[PDB]
Amino acid sequence: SATFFATQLQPLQAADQNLFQATKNLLENLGVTDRVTLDRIAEVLDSCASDDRTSKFQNPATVDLRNALMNFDEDVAAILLSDPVSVIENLEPVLQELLDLWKFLNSSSTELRLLLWSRLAEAYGRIKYTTKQFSCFLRSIEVIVADFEGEEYASTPPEARKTLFMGMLKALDDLIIQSLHLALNDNSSFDIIDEDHLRSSMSAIAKVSCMLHVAAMYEDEGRIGILPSPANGSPQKSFLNKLQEMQVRTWSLQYTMLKVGINQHPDIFPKPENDLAEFLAAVHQVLGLRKCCKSSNRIFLKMMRVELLKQKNIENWEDYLGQVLYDLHGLKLGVGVWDVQDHGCEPENLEKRQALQLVEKVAMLANRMSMKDLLKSDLKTTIERMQQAIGSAKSSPQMSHNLRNYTEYLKSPIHPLHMYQALTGGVHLDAVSINTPESAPAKQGWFFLLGMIALTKFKGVDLNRRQTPGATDDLRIAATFLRLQLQYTPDRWDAWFRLAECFDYELEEAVLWTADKMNKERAELVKFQRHAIHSYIMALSHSYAWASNPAALTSLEDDEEALYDMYHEFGMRLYSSSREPFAMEPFEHGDHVHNQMTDYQVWKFAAHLFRKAMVGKPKDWKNPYMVAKCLWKMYQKPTEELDEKNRRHRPTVQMVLDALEKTIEVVSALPKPRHGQEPILEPHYKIVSVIWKLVKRGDLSPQEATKVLQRQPYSPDHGKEVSVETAEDFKAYIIRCLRYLRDKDKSNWQ
Amino acid sequence: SATFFATQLQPLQAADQNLFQATKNLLENLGVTDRVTLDRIAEVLDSCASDDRTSKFQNPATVDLRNALMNFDEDVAAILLNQRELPQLNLSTFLEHAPVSVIENLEPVLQELLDLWKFLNSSSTELRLLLWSRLAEAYGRIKYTTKQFSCFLRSIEVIVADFEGEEYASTPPEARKTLFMGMLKALDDLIIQSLHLALNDNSSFDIIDEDHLRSSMSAIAKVSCMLHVAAMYEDEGRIGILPSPANGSPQKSFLNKLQEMQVRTWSLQYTMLKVGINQHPDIFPKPENDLAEFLAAVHQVLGLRKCCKSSNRIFLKMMRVELLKQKNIENWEDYLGQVLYDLHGLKLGVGVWDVQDHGCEPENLEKRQALQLVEKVAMLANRMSMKDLLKSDLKTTIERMQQAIGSAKSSPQMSHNLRNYTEYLKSPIHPLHMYQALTGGVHLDAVSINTPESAPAKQGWFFLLGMIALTKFKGVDLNRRQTPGATDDLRIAATFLRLQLQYTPDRWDAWFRLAECFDYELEEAVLWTADKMNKERAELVKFQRHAIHSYIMALSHSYAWASNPAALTSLEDDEEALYDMYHEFGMRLYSSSREPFAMEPFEHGDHVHNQMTDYQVWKFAAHLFRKAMVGKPKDWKNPYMVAKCLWKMYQKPTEELDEKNRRHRPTVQMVLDALEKTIEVVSALPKPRHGQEPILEPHYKIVSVIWKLVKRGDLSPQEATKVLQRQPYSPDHGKEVSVETAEDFKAYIIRCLRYLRDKDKSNWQHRLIIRHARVLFDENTDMNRPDAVEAAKAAFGVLRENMFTKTMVMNVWKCDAERPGRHHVYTERYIRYVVKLLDVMNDRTNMGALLRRIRKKGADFYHFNELWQYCVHTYVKLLRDTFNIPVSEEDVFKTLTPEEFDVVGEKIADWAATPDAENHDALGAMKEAVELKKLNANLMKAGLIDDLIADCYTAVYSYVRPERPNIIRKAEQAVQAALRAAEGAAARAGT
């Protein structure tokens, strides 16, 4: 029972001890030499090192508070429940007859004294000298602490000491409310405040924080059930929150003194953001263990939200703000060392401008997470709350100019001149990078991120495994999101590339399921390919300047993998549209003025991309094989159909067979496939078919073909020389080549 | 005739040549390689290289303008003079010539799309210009600022192309004359909105690429090529080659409309060239220089043709703003001065060029215009001295600008800071702050106010203002200022430096010039009238009290300034001025601790705080003089006042010294070298010119000092002769004199005093001459010495030769090193020595003659009533010393009845009329005592005068009888009957 109570009380008391210890270190960093304050802090520390924390306190007002909380009194708790230039000339020397008034100051009540401060603060309020008003707020408070430790308080009878102190504490409350409001809402509060005025100031506030910590002992002992807990609706329970809302104000007021205290000391605090954050992490730990952060309209919680967004290079600010956003709006990031602790705060609804401040830090955390993990995490659920709160941006006329240039470029015919300009990166769109606060999502690429999430929804739901369509609306959501991101950003070649990716998946959905669209709606399929190809051009053009930019290759190394995939997906698109059922169908100029590409020049273009995709992805066995397909189709092209320049640049039998030996060399460089995985016979099968056609054409002798045909790893009589002199003996060995390949074709799918 | 016309044309043609040359070079440097534009500019060069500029032009539009202006037609000018009325979007107008959806149709135009292009090659020019107006309207309707601006640029290139177009070249000229002005009305209205968007929103230069810039800005130069001949046409009437158009004519209104069009289009050229120079800084390494030279070429051409104020001064309101942002040009001040002369008349008188008239009237400069004019003037103000400020026209511009700015309104910080200056000024003097001032550790409670109204004071604008006002106060010397009344600039500068110090308390220089204003205010009260020293002592203490507080805060903020090297070079005269602060702190401190002031600002009689000693303040001042001596190595006064400091410290006796400063007492030798240190610097001075008195002020001072301490016993008289012969004014210099007695020390010092009086040819060194009397006759000697009457006579022979007249008038003239209020005191210090001098000599005759001079010069004597006590009582002694008057201790008139006393008192008066009573000493001493009561006029108590009268009357009564108010009354009638017989005897002798 008692050991269980000590086990429950121990980590929160450890948090309090570390909070007061780091507070003490922050005091001693600034030359605060008030040993009374240090002794009060050490009294708090040894009290929190004890089970009976209230016994070790020896300040008289704190044990008066202990008697007030122990012996509840209804009315005592209900107590807590014209030229200004002339006046400031009167009171400022006060705060020969001046020495008599100073003697009159010592003979007077403290309640009379604060009215002199309040009249002085009114005169500063009349001339709007808020800094002097903030100063005399602080000068008023430290007098009430001195008489709290005064011997007149010690000589007071305890029946008088109940009500007289209770008036002073209630008067202490409303000064803090005004001063914190002057601290939070006005930056000029700390101009005339010197160090020793400040060193007198927060030491009183820390003592007040020490004083309120004595009141904090009753609640947590009342939380467990050793103490009688007040009923709901009782004025005692209402009195506790009336105390605790000041404590929320107190440390935040202490934080404003700490923030000025952290500043002006660069030799003392080389990491000034973190030490400010360390206090704020500790206090919200202290309040959040005690369920105290939600009170007083979350003014501390709203304050800490602003400060974390200012700080950038903190280690684990995301741990701190994640606890805040779980408290404020229930935005579970799911990252960081500490899980989000239950603080009993309702999730307040996410306002749009409130969501838009968080974009610059959300996208930083989301950029390091894998897309598959981004499907599983709660990080996307924050984005779902954010984007619904943010919504669609306003219709800018500058965006509408950039929008309408996209529609005519996407319906533009395929210019062969611009293909060579894509090699130079000279293809530019009629667009301008606009400068608006609505583009600050696009300046961080937030609309790019929305496209990647919905694409991974499309990529995650496997189309081969799709027995039910209709979940392609997210692709249309992403395509609108990609069009939104591309309007602000011309240079985002990846946004062009994902746009180029999305057009094929719409085309794949049309042609895989129904063959009727190949007979009735060919024009929109022509439109989709031409939409894809022109998307790839700027995805080639803007990536070429990106590849020419060396610092752009440094960040996000997977985009270089996306760069080489774009090189693969370029020539994949070129070879696909040049054959059936299309056969250069987007390349027509029936409604078009300009030249068209030939199929030969398309196949001349695509292999060099596959040559470039071979360099970046050497384990990609397709890229040498796709090189070998196009050059053989270039070898399929007759010389008379070629012009004079391209007749010299037609591939030779030496260079065609160079790539045919190259692709199976790369296939042999791969490790062997596992059980249940047959190796790809298509590099092995297609090299035989061209050689058989080369013998059928007669450019390749069957004797010299069989030298090539027995270097294959799946050759009949491999490693043993077989000489061939007749075509029928060649056709017999070709039959032996096919049937031995049919031995490797176990599933009968070649 | 023609040679004269070419001579007048030659600066105009040179300016046009340099303008088009710079335009050609900058167009070439932007890559505009169109040969036709270069050929047009070269044709303008051919025009400007010859007298017949008009014949060399061969472009059809230029010669069409030339033909239009050679024979002017009113109906030709009617469409340009009247405003443009736009035909609407009508099918009938389309037949005659033949917002987003409007953008989506028309911007494709700018096979059915190709059908429009063939038609637009054959349609009207303005029909295309209608669409460019319509597209800019749609761009205006969507409020695209850059796209609406871009349509304006393309529309310019249309109508320039038609002037090279063959449709206009093949038009019949009667139709073309309407067509030339009709396009020109369409031309000029486009430049109205083109300039307006180019000087309001800078977003209009967004979508312009390189070639768009190279297309648009080249056509503007063609307009600048074409419009040049119109100003050339006006120049023919300017020299009288052609007749001028009459005022109020259509010819006059046609011409100035072309003037306000030509300047307006030229301002558009500056906007494209500014954006075009940027983005290519390799081509333009100094973009401030080329933009200034481009504006210099434009404004000089328009200025000679008086086009600056044209088109509502829109070029001038652009040029001044862009010159303000640039700071590191050389001779921008040349470019600034002519521009502000064209707008306000603020002639600066600096740079290479003086102002030349551009035919423009000034406008009164407003407050916000002056705030932009703060910074460039303030740098230009610091280049000149205050004397050069007092001769420049820049001073006249500043007084307008302060009239333009006005007095600033007080902030709550300003009410806080200026009050704390007064409370510090009302504070008593503490030695802690002066010890802190040597550390520089004194600060004031005054926050640095951060407002744009302090950006004047951040340049020291208010600091400049008092420096002008103090220069005018210092411009007339106060020796030559015989007319007080030109003294309000002292109070004007006194108001100004507080306003500087409110925003900038840390400026040590603003505290220092504030102190001299309080210092000079102390002079003018006491220089003419000693009555303020007589009656108004409560205010004269306050001036030096507030001076000393201001002198502290000058020193404290100087300590950071004098010890850091960064301020040690900036405005090197202020480094020289910092050593002048040390010299006038010590001359202020040493002044207020002696007569007439006598330590008055030091006390705390209103209050708590310890007051300083004079020994504490003499050592404090001597700290300043040596610190003055390093930065003033040739200034002899800084060793001179440090020599006077230790002598006051040495003459201060050791008993009243504190035991800390008892160890800090300098030796007898420690003042001898410092006097010789001054006489070293005086010997190190350059030799004085003819008519200049040499500085023997060290020389008799060390003579007087060595006279004292030898007679005080600090040195033997033999050892003094070596120290005396080191000095440059030693008589028989280099010849050794051995002195064994004090009388031998008396004679040689008298020979030194005679030698210095040989150098007193102007007869001014009365301190030497009163010490020549002092060495001859010491005050503290025994009165019964037999030579003391003789030594006072030889002392009087020195004084009456030099300063004292035969009617006993001394001439205490104010020395240049003498302090204000000191010579009033120094006169009566010479009086009390002279009164005791004539006491030993028993000179009763010259005392009464001197007494009339004291009575006449009563207002000139400090503490004159107290001086009249000592002089009368010594003369009462001198009346008793000369005449041996017994003191009537016993009243002999008690035996007389008042009836019998009237009998004897009339018998005494009848005895006094006898000539035997003239030899009576008691009657004669009563006669001067009667005149002494008349000369008193109850300035003192008259009862002491009546004591000498009644004792003289009783001594008379002790003589006539063998032969209190009634006693004096019968004594009054005794002198009255005596003087009646004296006038009766003198009257009968003359008859």
Short mmCIF file of C-alpha atoms in Angstrom, two decimals, chain A residues 85 88-89 92 99 127-129 131-132 191-192 397-398 400-402 404-405 430 432 434, chain B residues 100 103-104 107 139 142-144 147 206-207 412-413 415-417 419-420 445 447 607-608:
data_model
loop_
_atom_site.label_atom_id
_atom_site.label_comp_id
_atom_site.label_asym_id
_atom_site.label_seq_id
_atom_site.Cartn_x
_atom_site.Cartn_y
_atom_site.Cartn_z
CA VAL A 85 2.44 63.01 -15.93
CA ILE A 88 4.34 59.69 -12.07
CA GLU A 89 6.32 62.75 -10.94
CA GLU A 92 8.48 57.43 -8.85
CA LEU A 99 12.83 59.99 3.67
CA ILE A 127 0.47 57.38 -21.40
CA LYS A 128 0.61 53.79 -22.81
CA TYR A 129 4.11 53.23 -21.37
CA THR A 131 7.10 48.63 -20.43
CA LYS A 132 7.06 50.82 -17.32
CA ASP A 191 12.89 47.01 -22.65
CA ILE A 192 13.63 48.92 -19.43
CA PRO A 397 -5.68 34.49 -62.13
CA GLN A 398 -1.96 33.69 -62.30
CA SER A 400 -5.52 30.16 -64.38
CA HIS A 401 -2.96 31.41 -66.89
CA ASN A 402 -0.69 28.51 -65.95
CA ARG A 404 -4.77 26.98 -69.53
CA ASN A 405 -1.26 26.60 -70.93
CA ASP A 430 4.35 29.03 -70.64
CA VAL A 432 5.45 31.63 -64.08
CA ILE A 434 3.90 32.73 -58.51
CA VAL B 100 -11.01 35.13 -69.61
CA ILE B 103 -8.06 36.12 -73.47
CA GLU B 104 -8.65 32.54 -74.65
CA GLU B 107 -4.08 35.67 -77.32
CA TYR B 139 -6.13 41.80 -68.52
CA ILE B 142 -8.71 40.16 -64.39
CA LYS B 143 -6.25 42.72 -62.88
CA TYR B 144 -3.16 40.99 -64.27
CA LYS B 147 -0.01 41.05 -68.73
CA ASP B 206 7.91 40.05 -64.56
CA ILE B 207 7.12 38.22 -67.79
CA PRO B 412 6.25 59.15 -23.55
CA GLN B 413 9.94 58.24 -23.68
CA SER B 415 8.71 63.07 -21.51
CA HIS B 416 10.57 60.47 -19.45
CA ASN B 417 14.06 61.25 -20.73
CA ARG B 419 12.55 65.11 -17.14
CA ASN B 420 15.40 62.87 -15.95
CA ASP B 445 18.19 56.90 -17.00
CA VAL B 447 16.18 54.92 -23.00
CA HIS B 607 20.01 68.65 1.55
CA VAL B 608 23.14 63.69 2.98
#
